[PDB]
Amino acid sequence: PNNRYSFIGGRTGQWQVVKIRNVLGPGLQLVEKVNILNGAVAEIPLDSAWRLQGFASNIRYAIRTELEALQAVVPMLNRAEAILAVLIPIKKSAQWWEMAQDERRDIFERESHHTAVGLEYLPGVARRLLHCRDLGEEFDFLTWFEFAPEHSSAFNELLLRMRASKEWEYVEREVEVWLKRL
Amino acid sequence: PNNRYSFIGGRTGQWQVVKIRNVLGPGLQLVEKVNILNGAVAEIPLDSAWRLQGFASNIRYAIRTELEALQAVVPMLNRAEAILAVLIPIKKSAQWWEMAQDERRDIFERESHHTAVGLEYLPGVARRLLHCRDLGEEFDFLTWFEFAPEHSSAFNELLLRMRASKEWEYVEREVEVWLKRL
Numbered sequence: 001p002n003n004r005y006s007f008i009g010g011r012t013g014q015w016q017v018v019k020i021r022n023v024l025g026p027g028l029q030l031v032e033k034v035n036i037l038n039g040a041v042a043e044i045p046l047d048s049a050w051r052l053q054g055f056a057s058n059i060r061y062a063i064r065t066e067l068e069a070l071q072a073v074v075p076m077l078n079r080a081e082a083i084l085a086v087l088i089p090i091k092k093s094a095q096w097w098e099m100a101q102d103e104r105r106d107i108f109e110r111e112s113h114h115t116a117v118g119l120e121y122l123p124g125v126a127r128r129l130l131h132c133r134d135l136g137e138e139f140d141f142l143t144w145f146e147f148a149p150e151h152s153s154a155f156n157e158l159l160l161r162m163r164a165s166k167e168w169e170y171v172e173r174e175v176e177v178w179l180k181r182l
Numbered sequence: 183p184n185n186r187y188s189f190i191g192g193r194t195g196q197w198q199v200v201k202i203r204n205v206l207g208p209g210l211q212l213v214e215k216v217n218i219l220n221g222a223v224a225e226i227p228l229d230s231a232w233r234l235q236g237f238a239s240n241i242r243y244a245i246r247t248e249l250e251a252l253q254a255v256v257p258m259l260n261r262a263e264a265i266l267a268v269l270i271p272i273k274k275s276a277q278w279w280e281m282a283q284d285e286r287r288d289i290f291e292r293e294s295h296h297t298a299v300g301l302e303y304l305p306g307v308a309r310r311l312l313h314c315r316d317l318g319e320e321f322d323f324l325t326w327f328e329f330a331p332e333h334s335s336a337f338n339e340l341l342l343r344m345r346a347s348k349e350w351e352y353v354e355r356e357v358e359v360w361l362k363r364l
């Protein structure tokens with residue numbers, strides 16, 4: 001299997017763009033669809049507005065008991081019912097990346113309860129975390145969420161709780177690409 | 183700045199290959215020299231035998247007090263006297279990468295005291311850690327050490343201690359490329 005994923009905003013793809021919300025910092029040009037490829041894409045179709053990419057990686061913060069709680073409720077991607085998705089690219093500040101591992105873990109979970117909060121929205125919400133700072137990309141992470149319409153309200157609630165977190169004080173660019181499965 | 187480094191084994195470079203010691207698992211072909219480039223190289227050069235690459239990244243394990251101690255004593259790269267170097271590509275097992283963050287930190291420092299042991303030798307040894315599992319490379323890490331002859335015996339003692347640690351029970355491929363500055 002290949003750990004690289006590419007998200008190309010343009011006129012083709014498996015996902016229709018519903019809405020792009022430019023939450024913080026420079027946004028992303030509106031496009032019609034998102035095409036998702038499991039691999040690297042050196043050059044995009046010239047009818048494409050942007051390309052984002054990241055890799056699936058190892059665990060950086062979650063501890064064993066947290067992983068065991070997640071595994072108990074985590075849903076799979078590509079559920080038939082999960083016709084809504086959101087792609088949320090995120091960039092954190094240089095101050096964050098300069099911090100040591102204990103400092104970042106303390107903000108992520110002991111102060112912000114990132115995993116404990118997210119667990120409350122499983123199994124409704126399926127997700128994929130990709131990393132891209134080490135690729136030299138403009139964002140540091142591509143986060144992906146998908147779910148049935150019955151969980152839209154809960155997901156909006158989750159977003160409000162996260163954006164109010166200490167961890168968010170270090171986010172410096174964020175965009176939401178709302179999607180509907182074709 | 184560019185976070186990517188390539189190490190090309192072949193007939194050109196800043197470092198002469200003294201010997202290659204294929205410590206564990208498949209080795210690396212003997213070559214005359216190692217060429218180090220602060221950038222990606224798309225393909226292995228025609229007459230070169232291999233191309234290793236990795237990126238400099240954020241801290242994964244060290245805590246603030248450890249980083250303070252390290253940053254206070256580590257020497258700069260390219261000291262006049264640091265005419266010896268060793269490039270040690272390392273691969274860890276799938277069992278390692280499936281462990282959680284607390285499980286890996288506990289092996290890396292609580293059990294093995296990797297940083298505390300390294301610190302004993304670090305005043306005279308300049309180091310660079312690079313990551314490459316996430317690039318799809320055959321190794322997980324490229325580690326780089328350079329020092330004066332005066333520190334050769336001490337560096338071998340460090341290697342003796344590290345290969346006996348709990349951490350290295352998870353190393354599954356390792357090569358030593360011993361070098362001398364041209």
Ligand code: HEM
Nearest residue numbers: 058059060061062088090115118119121125127141143162
């Ligand atoms: C839906 C429930 C969620 C759960 C269960 C959850 C869980 C997790 C876990 C366990 C990690 C740590 C992975 C590791 O240790 O490497 C993580 C990372 C991350 N999550 Fe969430 N998450 C959820 C929702 C969200 C949302 C809604 C966002 C964005 C608004 C988000 C953004 C991120 C980011 C940016 C990271 C990377 C943090 C870093 O490495 O600095 N998560 N998530």
Ligand code: HEM
Nearest residue numbers: 240241242243244270272297300301303304307323325344
């Ligand atoms: C010379 C003194 C040394 C010091 C001060 C030292 C220090 C460190 C530190 C602080 C890290 C963790 C960086 C982080 O938190 O991400 C690290 C990682 C690593 N070091 Fe060393 N080290 C030394 C020698 C060595 C040697 C001789 C080897 C190889 C034989 C080695 C192989 C590694 C590897 C493979 C990693 C990555 C571990 C992982 O992420 O699983 N180190 N080192």
